[PDB]
Design a protein around this ligand. Sequence first.
Ligand SMILES: Nc1ncnc2c1ncn2[C@@H]1O[C@H](COP(=O)(O)OP(=O)(O)O)[C@@H](O)[C@H]1O
Ligand SMILES: [Mg+2]
Length: 911
Amino acid sequence: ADLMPRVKVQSVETVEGCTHEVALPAEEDYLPLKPRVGKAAKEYPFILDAFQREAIQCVDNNQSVLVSAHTSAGKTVCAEYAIALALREKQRVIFTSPIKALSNQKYREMYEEFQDVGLMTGDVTINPTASCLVMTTEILRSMLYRGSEVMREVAWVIFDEIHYMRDSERGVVWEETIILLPDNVHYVFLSATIPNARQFAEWICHLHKQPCHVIYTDYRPTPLQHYIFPAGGDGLHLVVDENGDFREDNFNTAMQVLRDSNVFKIVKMIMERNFQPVIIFSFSKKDCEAYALQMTKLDFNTDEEKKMVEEVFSNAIDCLSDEDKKLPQVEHVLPLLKRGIGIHHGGLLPILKETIEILFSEGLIKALFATETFAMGINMPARTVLFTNARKFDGKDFRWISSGEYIQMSGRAGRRGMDDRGIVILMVDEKMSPTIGKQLLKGSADPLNSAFHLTYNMVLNLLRVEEINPEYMLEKSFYQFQHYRAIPGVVEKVKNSEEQYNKIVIPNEESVVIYYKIRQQLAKLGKEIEEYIHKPKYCLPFLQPGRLVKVKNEGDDFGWGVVVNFSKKSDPLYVVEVLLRCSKESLKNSAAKPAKPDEKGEMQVVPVLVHLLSAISSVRLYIPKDLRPVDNRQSVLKSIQEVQKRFPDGIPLLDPIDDMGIQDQGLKKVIQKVEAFEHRMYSHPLHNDPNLETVYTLCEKKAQIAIDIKSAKRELKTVLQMDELKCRKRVLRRLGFATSSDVIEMKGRVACEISSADELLLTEMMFNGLFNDLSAEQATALLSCFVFQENSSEMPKLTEQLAGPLRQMQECAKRIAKVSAEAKLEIDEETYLSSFKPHLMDVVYTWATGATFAHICKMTDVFEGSIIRCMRRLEELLRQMCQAAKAIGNTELENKFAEGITKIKRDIVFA
Ligand SMILES: Nc1ncnc2c1ncn2[C@@H]1O[C@H](COP(=O)(O)OP(=O)(O)O)[C@@H](O)[C@H]1O
Ligand SMILES: [Mg+2]
């Protein structure tokens, strides 16, 4: 209907310390907020910082608020006031958080103060009905879709960590929950620094016809000072200050040492100088645990503290069974804890990881080694954060930690009250340019950008609800609320087109354009002559050492340089090391950049792929070996220079047809045209005319301005992900889930219940009788495959009791890939059937028999924690599958799956 968002942000004057703006519908006029009609919903012992006061007042005026501030500032102060007005006026409230662990402590942190609280997480329902219900975002989405009544009395939904909407996988759940939520509800959003905070406000203003205020402060309660440890270095160096200033001088020095037990010295130093507590963030479970055993050589705890650790560990581990209290981890973790040394990793049994968390808060662990995700976990802030590496593997390739990652993990430094200041240390193992360090340490926080991925649970559930259609979510989605730039695209199109018209009177007649095409086509034909020269059959025999070759990147010309070697590394791609002039700055780089016109620059060895060589020259010149010294590298410049002085036209070049090699391929045809175009040029009347250089330059601007105008017009159709819904709707109709008129069918309504896993395969397998005629023990293992997505494991040999079911899951999985392909979906059959992993299948059947976890832990190499996560996720899948069978009324299946939940739910898991 071509109806687009019409929302205006109006600035609200702010006392020093906050930026307050108010997103409002354009039609609605701005009225200043009313003040404190009620004396106080809640009273805080602490003296409120200015941002807290402006945000709370918005809660008071029943106007929605979005808060962005650093992780030690009092963002929660805003959540607790909202919960207080809600409990006071009796309106029900919900707190929704990204991870379950934030919720389990937050239920308790909220329960003590309020005591009319409930927890809704898949693992547990406590006080299922209460005025304040802590719901994970995932259960809210289920509840909103299920037509549950808990959302009837809610007028405040508190979305903590809305900056977790960015992730592709769970970003749909937050965006979906906000759209499904009624326009009546007012929402308080708690986020860390986000550059695009205003846009989020405009979404909740357009989406819910209300004002979403935005409060932004850069306040950090405890100043953080950033440090870097060069390898093999006596001391730490101050790269960044409390004032935030970047010290390049020290950073290059710290770097300078880098050109030419390490953790133990840094940890020991921190402890001696009272920089404790230190969270050492290692990127691997193998590195973190192994590092701790290094510090076992030192005792960091008092004798009184050791008794307190023993009293806490045993009170905590009393819950476990006597055979269970002797598991290989339980015995081993206590000694490390006594010394003040702790491990926080996802390979940990859950009861132990919570004990480590309670002790660190209580001060009984003074050096905690943690994997990154402890960062996502609530609180547990420290004085010093130490990074055992500056690079984290992305699976496809190893990469430096993103600016955003340093900002989260560095913010666990600076306890607000105990520490006057906070200290952050990075250990760098590879050369880094100042440009990388300025971004990693001083990086602006990542923008909050949508990752709306359509899921069959999204399409199927929306078909069930009568009022809404799957397409509704697409239009109200954050991804289609970037409609805010279409109006900008139009402003450039008209403005640029008017500019072309002012240029058109200045531009000359089409006769110059005719030359431009002949000049441009000859350049285009020229690139084709180069494509043949780069070919590894002809170029490589000729890329001998000492040769004069010219290297050009995209938009960068390095110019003449002398080859040092010929080699194959990384259709194979061949790498030639060509000495090329490069900026004196490129010496610092770990990406080498061509010398600027200002400086002569310094020659250096830049690995160059053969594909980048513009030209190969028939002049080979001497390269001194030991090209390390600045004098030897610069000497070649004088030698390449004499070749340029001796020859006026330029260095001679080897003709591909004769000197370079056998051009059996018809380059003669590209060359045949090249000469004629040169003949067409020059013969063209406008050749070498007086003031031609300026006369021709204008012609280029008009062409490129047209390119800019033409290109922008292509990007201005809408309907961005409709092809995916269209293809996804077709797979559902074919498989049997929905009718051709888009009405859900009973096969479909079962899949709406299985939202913890692949709804399509499990509902289709359920129909083909796969689950039927299988012992509950066999069924529990097969459903595990859906909820295990790890790696670096070898399948335990599977007997026909467990392999035969697996061979049959694949057949349904192969069909779903095939129906998906004929539906123009992007599924690759191999990944889909491999997505479900059979690695932990024999560790779930053995658990079903009644074997203790220790037998189970031995059967597979997986860390104890991967087994616990798979098992509670399996208990839910079983719970979702048993409800699904109610719809089809299969009595055995509902009981068989319910039998499975009882057999699996035992001992240390589900503690
Ligand atoms: N006025 C205040 N200034 C600074 N810190 C405060 C203040 N009041 C409470 N705090 C402390 O700061 C934290 C409150 O903010 P927090 O819950 O960390 O927000 P978020 O988790 O959203 O970053 C808690 O440690 C709290 O005890
Ligand atoms: Mg928090």
